[PDB]
Write a protein that binds this DNA or RNA. Sequence first.
RNA 1: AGGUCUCUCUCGU
Length: 462
Amino acid sequence: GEIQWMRPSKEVGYPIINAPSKTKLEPSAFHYVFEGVKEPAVLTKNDPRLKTDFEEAIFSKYVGNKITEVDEYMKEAVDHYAGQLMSLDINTEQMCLEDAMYGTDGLEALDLSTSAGYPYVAMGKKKRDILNKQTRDTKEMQKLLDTYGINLPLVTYVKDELRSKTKVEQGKSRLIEASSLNDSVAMRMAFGNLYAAFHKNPGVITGSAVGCDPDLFWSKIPVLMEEKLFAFDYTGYDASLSPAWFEALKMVLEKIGFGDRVDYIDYLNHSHHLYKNKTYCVKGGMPSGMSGTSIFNSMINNLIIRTLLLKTYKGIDLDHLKMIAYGDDVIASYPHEVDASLLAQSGKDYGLTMTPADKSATFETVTWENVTFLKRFFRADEKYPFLIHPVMPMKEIHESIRWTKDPRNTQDHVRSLCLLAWHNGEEEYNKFLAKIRSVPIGRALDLPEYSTLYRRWLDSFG
RNA sequence: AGGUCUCUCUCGU
């Protein structure tokens, strides 16, 4: 991924965009009960905590594109992957515009709580002004496609979120690309039938976890897996993906019956952006807040591991490779240890820089005791070893509870952390309840017990 | 101040 030019919006007649500057994250009643090192990521150049140039920092994510031509390894990775997807027999029909707006089985309606992008936002128009849920009115939307068309500019925003102190002072805040309401809809009409089929089939065929409830799905996973596992960590995966890879994605899309719409992958590969008072073009890298980012990133991720395996294990039967990906994240098995230490080399050529799983320095071997996926570990139930707990570690939960974006939801926030916390087990969980109850506000909360949550778990495999 | 998924809470037939 690499920028190409950048200039003052008014140079090109583009408006200034209001990008807010005050984090909504304020410390909570519980800020001092628990311990945590994480702080609200940086939003402007005049930040006390800053240690370098902001603008420089944030756009650094674009390191450049390496490969640009589907090599002979990639081309075969396409075939196998596309082959699997074919087993699913995916409806290739364009999605009904009414469906692509307000949703259908397997695909949720557009989000009315979020911005419509450019140009709707420069006039101050809101998704809620074009869309009505009861009527499910298509008309006015349809005029806006005739009007502004597709392939519109993405509005870039800084994410408002807690990050590590280094990341805060070092300036490595994350970046959102806000989809025009125009393209979300057009993307959907095309790939809506693709999106759902995925949403309906998390697993090792699709190779995507998009759509799985971890509380139930953590137990089905070890079954759908080979013996020796492997895993690693990407650096900047998104803003580092290279034009070749899209051509690879388009190829899989051709091979499964989506040949016409492959146009839209170019508008993701080659995109243009309004950051405040700047404008700029970018060759490569997924745009994050565009439609299908979960499903495309995932699909590409399926191609990479498939590829990089081949470059190393010439003569490896990919027909026994079992992976599930969630964008960059991934958990994967082959009956023999596919030494990840190497893969990360074959990577840095393809623009991909892979580090060892979970900030370890060394490429540790992977096991069902140290493997994470969607930030949760695997622990069999003490009473039913065929039942696996997804374990978010207390540390992360601590970090969440120290802040809030509105004390109104204090109750909901905390209830919500217990539903994650209690898989660590009765002792740790009851310890967590007492720390909450250590302050007056905590003692206000209606929280569930271990026995109720555990009951509920078992019940739901029923 | 984006795209999604899961869970949960609140109110409705």
